[PDB]
Design a protein around this nucleic acid. Sequence first.
RNA 1: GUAACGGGGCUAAACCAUGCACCGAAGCUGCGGCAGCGACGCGCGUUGUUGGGUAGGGGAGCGUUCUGUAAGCCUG
Lengths: 48, 103, 142, 58, 117
Amino acid sequence: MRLNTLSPAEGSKKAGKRLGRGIGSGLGKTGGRGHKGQKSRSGGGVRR
Amino acid sequence: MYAVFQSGGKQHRVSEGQTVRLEKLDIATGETVEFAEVLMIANGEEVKIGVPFVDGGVIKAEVVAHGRGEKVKIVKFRRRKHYRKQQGHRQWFTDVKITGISA
Amino acid sequence: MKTFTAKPETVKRDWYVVDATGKTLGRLATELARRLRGKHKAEYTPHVDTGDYIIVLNADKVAVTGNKRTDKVYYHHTGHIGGIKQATFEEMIARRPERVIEIAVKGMLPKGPLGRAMFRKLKVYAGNEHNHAAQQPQVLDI
Amino acid sequence: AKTIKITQTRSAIGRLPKHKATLLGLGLRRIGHTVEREDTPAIRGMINAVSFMVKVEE
Amino acid sequence: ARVKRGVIARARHKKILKQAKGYYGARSRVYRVAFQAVIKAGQYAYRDRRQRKRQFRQLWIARINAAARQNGISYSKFINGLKKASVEIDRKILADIAVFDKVAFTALVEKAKAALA
RNA sequence: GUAACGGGGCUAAACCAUGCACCGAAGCUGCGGCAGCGACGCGCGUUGUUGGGUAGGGGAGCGUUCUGUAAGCCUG
Ligand SMILES: [Mg+2]
Ligand SMILES: [Mg+2]
Ligand SMILES: [Mg+2]
Ligand SMILES: [Mg+2]
Ligand SMILES: [Mg+2]
Ligand SMILES: [Mg+2]
Ligand SMILES: [Mg+2]
Ligand SMILES: [Mg+2]
Ligand SMILES: [Mg+2]
Ligand SMILES: [Mg+2]
Ligand SMILES: [Mg+2]
Ligand SMILES: [Mg+2]
Ligand SMILES: [Mg+2]
Ligand SMILES: [Mg+2]
Ligand SMILES: [Mg+2]
Ligand SMILES: [Mg+2]
Ligand SMILES: [Mg+2]
Ligand SMILES: [Mg+2]
Ligand SMILES: [Mg+2]
Ligand SMILES: [Mg+2]
Ligand SMILES: [Mg+2]
Ligand SMILES: [Mg+2]
Ligand SMILES: [Mg+2]
Ligand SMILES: [Mg+2]
Ligand SMILES: [Mg+2]
Ligand SMILES: [Mg+2]
Ligand SMILES: [Mg+2]
Ligand SMILES: [Mg+2]
Ligand SMILES: [Mg+2]
Ligand SMILES: [Mg+2]
Ligand SMILES: [Mg+2]
Ligand SMILES: [Mg+2]
Ligand SMILES: [Mg+2]
Ligand SMILES: [Mg+2]
Ligand SMILES: [Mg+2]
Ligand SMILES: [Mg+2]
Ligand SMILES: [Mg+2]
Ligand SMILES: [Mg+2]
Ligand SMILES: [Mg+2]
């Protein structure tokens, strides 16, 4: 065991989501928000 | 003299001493292959048409090389619909040399 | 091993002479355009001219059926406003009988630089004489 | 039992949803596909339903 | 950790402008126009790998038609008589014999006419 | 500006009935290659089937800057 030989267990470090980085990623353009609503705006939505 | 034989879903007409590029075959790079079926043999006013094969005709060849062809590119586009995709391809082949044909 | 392609520096063309006396206009025209293009040879190549030279004699004895001799009309515009003109089959045989044969043949040929060059091989005369004995034309029974 | 050949000769695009379910119970998948079913009054009943696009060799 | 885009962004533009060599005007000098031109050239190439197989079979048939009528038979009857005689030679090979061996092609026409006898 | 056959032209190259050929698609078949799912048996083989896609959900990756491994390694 050295400082460059230790790895984490498999499944514990899933990567996050990055929005608006091209067509290939699957989350480009609208970023998972749809088209032209109140819920698609910045700081948009309704209370509990 | 030349003959016509079928190999790899296509047809070819060849003469002794030529080199032909075919689809991939599972034979080593120095061995000898025979093509039993022969569609037609023509020898200068002595023509034999098979129905569908010439009775007793054989073509002898020798495997020279294996390789991959040139790379082609596949582009898929759909305007105004937020879609695009690309791919690549190289196709295998086998080269043989005609050594003797005899019926 | 690619397929054969004819080269425009080795093509061999021949000379023919045809008599157009008592022959239907549009059935004689189709055969002429088949041979100006080269469709009758096993070396035919769509981007190469492989046709023959043809001489047409007696262009004012061509025939039509029905009432077409007085009913058929030819139209053209001169490029100035209100410049639509017209003539009938009677009137163009009387005026210029060669134009009838080559208007029909020009419409059965491809449109483009190559179709304009196939048209240079057609020679049409109104009478029974020509002056191409040096080229030694042959007789063709169309 | 007695068995028969069934082949599909036309396309399923644009057909009634109850027609598409008859070809699924018969087993046919594409044009020219052939299957080997047994000859019973229930198999012949659903051959009759799509006979305009099916050929039977007995 | 601040990242500068200069070196990577230059390599990606130089890649597109190399595929646009030989085009007219701004289509080989300007990235915005050249990127559009490269995508269209790839759309056409995919489409024309299909049309190449149509354009050649059309040329083979028109040459077999011309060579068979010099022997006294039309294309549609010449093909029918070869299937009745169990001849498996395809259009590509037939259109090669017609141009390079007039005598072998004649022997095939006589085989077909005896099948329709 | 012909301008209510796409044009040339057609007395059939028009319509009706019957027959045999042929052409014709990225459909089907042939040959070569790639990937997903399920079975049967020991990652492997045999086997059946699937692979157009906007909104959107799921899975696997490339490359850039900085910290350790690094008083190491490459470099006039
Ligand atoms: Mg999406
Ligand atoms: Mg928007
Ligand atoms: Mg989201
Ligand atoms: Mg909406
Ligand atoms: Mg709104
Ligand atoms: Mg919304
Ligand atoms: Mg907003
Ligand atoms: Mg005027
Ligand atoms: Mg007036
Ligand atoms: Mg004109
Ligand atoms: Mg005209
Ligand atoms: Mg056109
Ligand atoms: Mg012309
Ligand atoms: Mg001229
Ligand atoms: Mg429908
Ligand atoms: Mg820095
Ligand atoms: Mg920068
Ligand atoms: Mg880059
Ligand atoms: Mg730059
Ligand atoms: Mg870029
Ligand atoms: Mg410019
Ligand atoms: Mg330039
Ligand atoms: Mg430059
Ligand atoms: Mg730019
Ligand atoms: Mg075709
Ligand atoms: Mg008017
Ligand atoms: Mg039409
Ligand atoms: Mg006109
Ligand atoms: Mg009739
Ligand atoms: Mg008739
Ligand atoms: Mg009729
Ligand atoms: Mg009719
Ligand atoms: Mg009929
Ligand atoms: Mg096809
Ligand atoms: Mg398919
Ligand atoms: Mg296979
Ligand atoms: Mg396969
Ligand atoms: Mg998909
Ligand atoms: Mg250091």
